[PDB]
């Protein structure tokens, strides 16, 4: 690790600076360094880790979709042959994306998940594990595609089971997990009914628990509830 010589606190400080500067690749590298110190992450630190990689992989996924679209068009009838370049460059971006996903999955496996005993931390990491397997699934086309999809499903399901037992239906982690697992069902598992059912039930159960919340908690929960509604609107 190129970050092995830097203090944990300095890596966290720099991650925050990198965020302010919209330098998400640097932010992710700093957070990887922090994780690799081997201490558990606080809530704030878990959020820095997730923001960093979400932004990096988000950019890769957007690029991959642009390139995949061009490639798909090149394989329509009447399309002029332009050689291997579009495929090569899509493969290049794809490989980089896979690399980032493998890096995140690696941090989760060594050793964030196994050390996470509190529900909020364990659910957060298992949601991340489902998310990064989901990104792998989006680009998977070969022998392991079903196993990649199942790895996402398994991680999300474990997270769901803990979240339903240990957290209130308005908990933002529980909500965000449900949002993303619903998208997994719709976009990856070819299960739009499961996606819709999950989003609806999650929204309605949260609605019924809002009365217990402070103004600030209410704000946090309703923000994610609106994303559930936005998806339901898209799908129905």
């Amino acid at each position: 690790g190129a970050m092995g010589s830097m203090e944990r606190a300095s890596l966290i400080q720099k991650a925050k600076l990198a965020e302010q500067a919209e330098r998400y690749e640097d932010m992710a590298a700093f957070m990887k360094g922090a994780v690799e110190k081997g201490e558990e992450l606080s809530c704030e630190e878990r959020n820095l880790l997730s923001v960093a990689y979400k932004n990096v992989v988000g950019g890769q996924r957007a690029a991959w979709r642009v390139l995949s679209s061009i490639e798909q068009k090149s394989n329509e009838e009447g399309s002029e042959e332009k050689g291997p370049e579009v495929r090569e460059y899509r493969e290049k971006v794809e490989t980089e994306l896979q690399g980032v996903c493998d890096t995140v999955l690696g941090l989760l496996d060594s050793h964030l998940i196994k050390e996470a005993g509190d529900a909020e931390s364990r659910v957060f990491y298992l949601k991340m594990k489902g998310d990064y397997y989901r990104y792998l699934a989006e680009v998977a086309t070969g022998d392991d595609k079903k196993r990649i999809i199942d790895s996402a499903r398994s991680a999300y399901q474990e997270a769901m089971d803990i979240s339903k037992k240990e957290m209130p239906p308005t908990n933002p982690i529980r909500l965000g997990l449900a949002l993303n697992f619903s998208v997994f069902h719709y976009e990856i598992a070819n299960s739009p009914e499961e996606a819709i059912s999950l989003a609806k039930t999650t929204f309605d159960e949260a609605m019924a628990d809002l009365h217990t919340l402070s103004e600030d908690s209410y704000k946090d929960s309703t923000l994610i509830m609106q994303l559930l509604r936005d998806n339901l609107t898209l799908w129905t």
């Binding site: 949002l179 993303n180 998208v183 719709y186 976009e187 994610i224 994303l227 936005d230 998806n231």
Partner: peptide, 5 residues
């Protein structure tokens, strides 16, 4: 594309 967090 649907929302995720």
């Amino acid at each position: 594309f649907p929302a995720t967090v």
